[PDB]
Amino acid sequence: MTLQEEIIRQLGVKASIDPQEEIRKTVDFLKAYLRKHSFLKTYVLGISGGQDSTLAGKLAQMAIAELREETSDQAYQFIAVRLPYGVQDEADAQKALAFIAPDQTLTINIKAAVDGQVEALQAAGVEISDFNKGNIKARQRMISQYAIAGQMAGAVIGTDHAAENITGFFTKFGDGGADILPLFRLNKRQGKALLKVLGADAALYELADEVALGVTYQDIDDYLEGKLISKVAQATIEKWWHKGQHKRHLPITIFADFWK
Amino acid sequence: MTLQEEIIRQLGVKASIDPQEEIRKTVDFLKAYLRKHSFLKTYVLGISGGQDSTLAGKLAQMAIAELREETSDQAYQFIAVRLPYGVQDEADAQKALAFIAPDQTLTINIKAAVDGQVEALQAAGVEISDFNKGNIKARQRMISQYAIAGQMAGAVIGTDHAAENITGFFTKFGDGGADILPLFRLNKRQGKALLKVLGADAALYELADEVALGVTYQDIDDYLEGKLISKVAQATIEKWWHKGQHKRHLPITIFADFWK
Numbered sequence: 001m002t003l004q005e006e007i008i009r010q011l012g013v014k015a016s017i018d019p020q021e022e023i024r025k026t027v028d029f030l031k032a033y034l035r036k037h038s039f040l041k042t043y044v045l046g047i048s049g050g051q052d053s054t055l056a057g058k059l060a061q062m063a064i065a066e067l068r069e070e071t072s073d074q075a076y077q078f079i080a081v082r083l084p085y086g087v088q089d090e091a092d093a094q095k096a097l098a099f100i101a102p103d104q105t106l107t108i109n110i111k112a113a114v115d116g117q118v119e120a121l122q123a124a125g126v127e128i129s130d131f132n133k134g135n136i137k138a139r140q141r142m143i144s145q146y147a148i149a150g151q152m153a154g155a156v157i158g159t160d161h162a163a164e165n166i167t168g169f170f171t172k173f174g175d176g177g178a179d180i181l182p183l184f185r186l187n188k189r190q191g192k193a194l195l196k197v198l199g200a201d202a203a204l205y206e207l208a209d210e211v212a213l214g215v216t217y218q219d220i221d222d223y224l225e226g227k228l229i230s231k232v233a234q235a236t237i238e239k240w241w242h243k244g245q246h247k248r249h250l251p252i253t254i255f256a257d258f259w260k
Numbered sequence: 261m262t263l264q265e266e267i268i269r270q271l272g273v274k275a276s277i278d279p280q281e282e283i284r285k286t287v288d289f290l291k292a293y294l295r296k297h298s299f300l301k302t303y304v305l306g307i308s309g310g311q312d313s314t315l316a317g318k319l320a321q322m323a324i325a326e327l328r329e330e331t332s333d334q335a336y337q338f339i340a341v342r343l344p345y346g347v348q349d350e351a352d353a354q355k356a357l358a359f360i361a362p363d364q365t366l367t368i369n370i371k372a373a374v375d376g377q378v379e380a381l382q383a384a385g386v387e388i389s390d391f392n393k394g395n396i397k398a399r400q401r402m403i404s405q406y407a408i409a410g411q412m413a414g415a416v417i418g419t420d421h422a423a424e425n426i427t428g429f430f431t432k433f434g435d436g437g438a439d440i441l442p443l444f445r446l447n448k449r450q451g452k453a454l455l456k457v458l459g460a461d462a463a464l465y466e467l468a469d470e471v472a473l474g475v476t477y478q479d480i481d482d483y484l485e486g487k488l489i490s491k492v493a494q495a496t497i498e499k500w501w502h503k504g505q506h507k508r509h510l511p512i513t514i515f516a517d518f519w520k
């Protein structure tokens with residue numbers, strides 16, 4: 001077994017998908033989770049305008065709408081959350097929301113919380129880089145979505161998928177803090193295929209990420225499909241893989257071995 | 261196997277321990293983790309004055325001091341963080357700090373962030389209960405500790421142990437959000453026993469938790485040690501155990517089975 005094969009098996013990625021089958025698999029999973037938990041009635045998700053939250057949101061909304069219909073229980077609701085830091089793509093978020101047409105939309109401006117946090121750090125003499133403040137924002141979004149879910153008998157949806165999970169390209173306990181992952185197993189192009197079949201405007205799924213990573217989503221996706229990619233791209237992916245292992249495990253106990 | 265036996269096996273608890281051996285196991289684990297990671301030089305931990313953070317802190321400090329001595333690398337530092345909400349257990353925290361004598365101590369007041377988060381929620385019409393605000397504070401504390409770690413090449417210590425893990429008595433991605441768990445495997449009295457051997461003032465290891473849970477630590481600890489306890493305490497523990505499973509796993513994918 002190569003490392004590539006091992007990654008593929010861990011992340012559950014298929015070389016190809018049937019998009020409609022994957023939509024159905026997802027929606028049925030989200031419905032089963034809701035039904036299993038007596039007190040859970042809502043899903044909560046930050047809608048940013050990016051591909052991942054657009055897709056997860058549409059699927060979650062579909063799950064809610066079907067369950068609501070099956071049960072005749074109107075308490076079943078999808079809660080879209082806008083989470084701008086101050087004056088935010090505002091256009092992209094608005095296209096996502098028209099595509100999803102959520103039962104409810106709330107706007108939580110995270111800027112007072114983030115600013116309060118940074119102020120308290122800088123006062124204690126802790127310098128905060130732009131990267132660091134980015135991670136604070138992602139975590140504050142987590143706090144926001146959990147506060148909403150805590151008050152509205154909800155679960156928080158995450159947008160993690162295989163193309164981000166392989167590179168560890170999320171904030172630990174930030175956008176990586178969620179209850180349920182509807183997109184886990186899909187690569188980036190597979191996510192686009194689902195959006196296309198759901199009827200999304202091509203703007204929602206047609207990069208700063210790739211430059212930051214040093215590798216394209218095309219290479220990442222090809223890798224996860226078992227294809228051969230360049231040596232550089234391969235080494236780059238493996239580096240991110242080994243680096244991000246702590247993000248793919250629970251907090252390290254004296255019994256854990258993955259890190260050694 | 262009973263459920264009790266299965267809980268014990270998962271949480272790694274011994275029916276009895278040698279405290280000094282357990283101190284050494286922990287410190288050696290903490291040192292190994294630091295040595296493994298080239299860029300990591302600091303441990304970061306919120307010092308509240310409670311038993312758990314006092315013990316984890318002392319052990320993390322010891323790991324830093326020994327490693328610093330072995331390597332002669334002065335970049336190795338333990339960073340104690342005071343995290344009051346406004347104007348605070350102030351006496352207890354001070355005794356913990358004197359007992360630990362940390363390389364550095366920072367104070368981050370979380371009130372501006374927390375208040376900014378709550379005000380933003382209330383402005384979107386979301387009511388926040390005291391319980392909810394409690395979870396917001398725990399999560400803001402997580403944010404603070406990670407921000408410090410992110411600037412100081414550090415890893416955040418968590419204070420989770422078997423007597424909290426069994427009852428799910430932490431906030432998910434709050435005080436549960438951490439990199440490394442030095443106390444994982446110990447029950448509550450076993451933690452006290454380590455503190456005693458380390459020389460701690462008896463005030464540091466001598467309530468609201470037990471009333472909130474409906475079961476005592478004595479019962480909890482006895483359970484984890486394979487002892488028989490009353491039926492009511494037993495059913496109470498199992499209730500918390502089943503409820504808290506989502507806290508003990510990674511976010512739910514379509515492949516996970518534990519929740520079904």
Ligand SMILES: [Cl-]
Binds near residue numbers: 515516517519
């Ligand atoms: Cl599972």
